[PDB]
Amino acid sequence: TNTSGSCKGRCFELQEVGPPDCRCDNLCKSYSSCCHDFDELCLKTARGWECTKDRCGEVRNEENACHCSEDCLSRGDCCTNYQVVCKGESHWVDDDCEEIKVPECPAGFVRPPLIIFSVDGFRASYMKKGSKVMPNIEKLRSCGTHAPYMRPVYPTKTFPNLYTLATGLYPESHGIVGNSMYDPVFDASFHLRGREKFNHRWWGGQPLWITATKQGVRAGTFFWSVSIPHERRILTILQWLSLPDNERPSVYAFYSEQPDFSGHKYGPFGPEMTNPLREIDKTVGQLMDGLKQLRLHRCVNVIFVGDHGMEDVTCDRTEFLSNYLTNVDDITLVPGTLGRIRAKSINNSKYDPKTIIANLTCKKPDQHFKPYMKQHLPKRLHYANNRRIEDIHLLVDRRWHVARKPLDCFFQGDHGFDNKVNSMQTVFVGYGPTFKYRTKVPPFENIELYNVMCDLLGLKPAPNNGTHGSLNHLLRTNTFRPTMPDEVSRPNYPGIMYLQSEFDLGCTCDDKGSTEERHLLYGRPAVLYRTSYDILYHTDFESGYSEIFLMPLWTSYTISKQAEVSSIPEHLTNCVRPDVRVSPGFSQNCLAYKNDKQMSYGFLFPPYLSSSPEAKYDAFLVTNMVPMYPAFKRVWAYFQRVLVKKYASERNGVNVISGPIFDYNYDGLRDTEDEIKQYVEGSSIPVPTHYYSIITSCLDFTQPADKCDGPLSVSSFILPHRPDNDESCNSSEDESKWVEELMKMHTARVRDIEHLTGLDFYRKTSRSYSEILTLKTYLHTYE
Ligand SMILES: *[C@@H]1O[C@H](CO)[C@@H](O[C@@H]2O[C@H](CO)[C@@H](O[C@@H]3O[C@H](CO[C@H]4O[C@H](CO[C@H]5O[C@H](CO)[C@@H](O)[C@H](O)[C@@H]5O[C@H]5O[C@H](CO)[C@@H](O)[C@H](O)[C@@H]5O)[C@@H](O)[C@H](O[C@H]5O[C@H](CO)[C@@H](O)[C@H](O)[C@@H]5O[C@H]5O[C@H](CO)[C@@H](O)[C@H](O)[C@@H]5O)[C@@H]4O)[C@@H](O)[C@H](O[C@H]4O[C@H](CO)[C@@H](O)[C@H](O)[C@@H]4O)[C@@H]3O)[C@H](O)[C@H]2NC(C)=O)[C@H](O)[C@H]1NC(C)=O
Ligand SMILES: O=C(CCN1CCc2nc(NC3Cc4ccccc4C3)ncc2C1)c1ccc2[nH]c(=O)oc2c1
Ligand SMILES: *[C@@H]1O[C@H](CO)[C@@H](O)[C@H](O)[C@H]1NC(C)=O
Ligand SMILES: [Cl-]
Ligand SMILES: [Zn+2]
Ligand SMILES: [Zn+2]
Ligand SMILES: [Zn+2]
């Protein structure tokens, strides 16, 4: 740690130097390792950041922050407005938009460089609301490629989101699950303020700068020390862009603490917010004028991106656990816009998580939070598979805070809430030679950007949570060619092979060709793991029956706009019929359900939607049967009897694909038969942790679902298979007052269902695979 070395000719060097030698890079301040003369040499401030008429053609002075001398361009250190003030040029923002059909790079450049310009707490609505005070940002947005909004990851905090942007991973996977964290294995705490965050043990996955370097692409610095002014960060980027071909980095990142810092104090739309926005825009202008005078403004790819949004949150809107709990001083709480509950460590043997959950469950009529055990949280949040995530979680309502007691105004804004909340949405703008011209694209999740950034730099992305090819429609060229995954298990197509007399399933029933075309509209789902399964055809539906799980992996059926809804006849209530195509040994039995005093059963294809009374008997086949708790049957029967027809009538028919999910380890991935921890009493019948449905129809609703030309439209859910309805505070009332609300909370992407089942959907369509990938990543928000 020898500080006696100098920074002379080493200011913001890109080669990192280890001990004893002192550092002259931007992170040297954060690690307290700079050479004695770092601030003096590298952080000059004299005469400001702008050229004036009088300074034009000046004699070079070492003391100045930036220069207005004739040699500054070749030295790559002019003030960004040099050519405008001195050489009579115009500001980039004043020029009309001209399409960049090919990169116009100076000789020597291997590829167009990438500049990631990141802004903290920049909410999606600032683009429209602040447009008049942001002309540079408006030019980038209007003449490049932009999304109306970009969805952040949960929690909608800085560190989990910036690290998701860099890696393409969910927080539960990269390890930065919050701004404040406690790892029980390390017995250490990660905080916004402190030296523990600098330890590399916390940061999982492979960020973009490591992906680049490992593939021989030079990466500039992503993390900047707070003491480095935004003008110096911009000039450092421009100076690095002026380096010789063999030293010049290809990927750069700028970061602005604003508008977040002001947002917390003044709220998202506080009158004080106009100045920070004008400032961010001025910084954009400086970068753009700086690139123009270096002849790079039609060669560099620029990404203007945010990490999260900002909501109106005051301390008057605070919910206290001391109003629900007796032992509030005997618990540790990560408070605010989310809640994570832990017991206090010493002499607290009476701590019961079940008592804390019960006392936080539907207690006040207007309660502004909901408790959950992390494995019961909506699957779309991907917030469970990490030891740094406490078992007790509190999902707090937008505009609300959670605190322990009145003991614990200053703030008018905050963020961290569910990532589907409007105020939490952020921005995406792509501008440059590889992005499209004057193009608007649909909203997407920030997990997807890492693959795009690799593509823009010709890199091979590390394994991540993005779906490579889903964002090809953003690019003019340098597109990745995606290929469908190969089917691992081929299906069996059984015929009639068994006699009714062979079946002693303890089941009783008073029961004395054009299917694939109508009910399987996008081909059969591909099974991407090793297993034994049968395709079963029926008049009203088709299924893929698992011999190992003794139930369908999937059930596919089309419900037209005009379909008639019938009831289950009184004499068929407890009817279960054997399927003469499937062996009694590969079949479920009624005796297991009679002997399970907590478990009942349901059907994947709804008997309520049968085409005829004759066809209705197929719905009662033992092979359409699935285990269901009585409480869950209330949810499932309402969905099947009421909601499927409602959707068919609203969407001009629907195609439904339903089935079970097994995720006992809550990792978001399909369980192997050895991971199943619950079976129907004294049986091989596994209990699903969740039930899914994929509801597809035509984007052009004037076309019926079964005769659709053009893009598709989808909505999906992953319902938790619970023995009670404590999640729904009005569950004592009629299902029409609570079931649909539950389902909206548990909305999912087709891609989320694919990970959990090992299935591959939409294999036989008239659409391009890139378009199908975009469809699979779609989340229906009801927001
Ligand atoms: C989102 O996308 C994710 C990424 O694809 C998915 O997560 C992956 O899930 C799988 C399955 O669960 C898991 O695979 C297992 O890996 C076990 C070994 O794990 C360690 O190594 C990997 C790989 O390390 C490489 O990459 C990193 C950079 O990412 C690099 O730093 C390493 O040096 C190493 O480099 C090599 O590869 C890179 C390219 O990636 C090259 O550039 C390089 O040259 C080298 O070739 C790590 O990623 C793991 O990291 C976890 O653990 C550390 C320490 O705890 C954390 O810091 C980190 O955040 C991460 O934690 C998360 O995952 C673990 C589980 O791994 C959770 O428990 C935790 O809660 C977090 O969520 C490890 O350090 C291996 O043992 C295992 O083997 C099993 O299967 C084989 C069959 O193949 C059997 O034979 C065995 O018996 C085992 O049963 C299996 O292969 C991945 O590790 C995991 N990756 C990550 C990043 O989490 C995720 O599922 C997906 N989400 C959804 C919902 O789809
Ligand atoms: O801790 C802080 C402020 C300190 N920041 C943290 C993030 C950071 N990122 C970068 N580089 C980016 C560029 C980039 C681009 C792509 C991918 C990764 C990255 C990394 N450089 C410096 C800093 C310093 C904080 C801020 C807001 C808060 N809001 C709140 O509620 O708490 C808050 C705490
Ligand atoms: C839960 O509520 C009951 C009744 O108000 C109370 O007796 C009990 O102490 C509470 N438990 C906790 C842990 O807050
Ligand atoms: Cl946090
Ligand atoms: Zn932030
Ligand atoms: Zn913040
Ligand atoms: Zn699993």
Curated annotation (Swiss-Prot):
Its cofactor is Zn(2+); Ca(2+). The active site is at residue 158. Residues 521-783 are annotated as: Nuclease-like domain. One of its GO terms (biological process) is phospholipid catabolic process. One of its GO terms (molecular function) is polysaccharide binding. Pfam families: Endonuclease_NS, Phosphodiest, Somatomedin_B. Residues 93-442 are annotated as: Phosphodiesterase. A motif (Cell attachment site) lies at residues 75-77. Its main location: secreted. One of its GO terms (cellular component) is membrane. N-glycosylation, but not furin-cleavage, plays a critical role on secretion and on lysoPLD activity. The interdomain disulfide bond between Cys-362 and Cys-729 is essential for catalytic activity. Changing residue 260 to N: Abolishes lysophospholipase D activity. 1-tetradecanoyl-sn-glycerol 3-phosphate binds at residues 158, 179, 260, 415. 1-(9Z-octadecenoyl)-sn-glycero-3-phosphate binds at residues 158, 179, 260, 415. Inhibited by vanadate. Inhibited by micromolar levels of bile salts, such as tauroursodeoxycholate. Not inhibited by taurodeoxycholate. Not inhibited by hydroxysterols, such as 7-hydroxycholesterol, testosterone, dexamethasone and prednisolone. Inhibited by EDTA and EGTA. It catalyses: a 1-O-alkyl-sn-glycero-3-phosphoethanolamine + H2O = a 1-O-alkyl-sn-glycero-3-phosphate + ethanolamine + H(+); a 1-acyl-sn-glycero-3-phosphoethanolamine + H2O = a 1-acyl-sn-glycero-3-phosphate + ethanolamine + H(+); 1-(9Z-octadecenoyl)-sn-glycero-3-phosphoethanolamine + H2O = 1-(9Z-octadecenoyl)-sn-glycero-3-phosphate + ethanolamine + H(+); a 1-O-alkyl-sn-glycero-3-phosphocholine + H2O = a 1-O-alkyl-sn-glycero-3-phosphate + choline + H(+). Ca(2+) binds at residues 663, 665, 667, 669, 671. The record marks 776 as: Essential for catalytic activity. SUPFAM superfamilies: Alkaline phosphatase-like, His-Me finger endonucleases, Somatomedin B domain. It is an enzyme of class 3 (hydrolase). Disulfide bonds join 7-24, 11-42, 22-35, 28-34, 51-68, 56-86, 66-79, 72-78, 97-143, 105-299, 315-409, 362-729, 507-590, 509-575, 698-708. Binds 2 Zn(2+) ions per subunit. Secreted lysophospholipase D that hydrolyzes lysophospholipids to produce the signaling molecule lysophosphatidic acid (LPA) in extracellular fluids. Its major substrate is lysophosphatidylcholine. Can also act on sphingosylphosphorylcholine producing sphingosine-1-phosphate, a modulator of cell motility. Can hydrolyze, in vitro, bis-pNPP, to some extent pNP-TMP, and barely ATP. Involved in several motility-related processes such as angiogenesis and neurite outgrowth. Acts as an angiogenic factor by stimulating migration of smooth muscle cells and microtubule formation. This is Autotaxin. It comes from Rattus norvegicus (Rat). The gene is Enpp2.
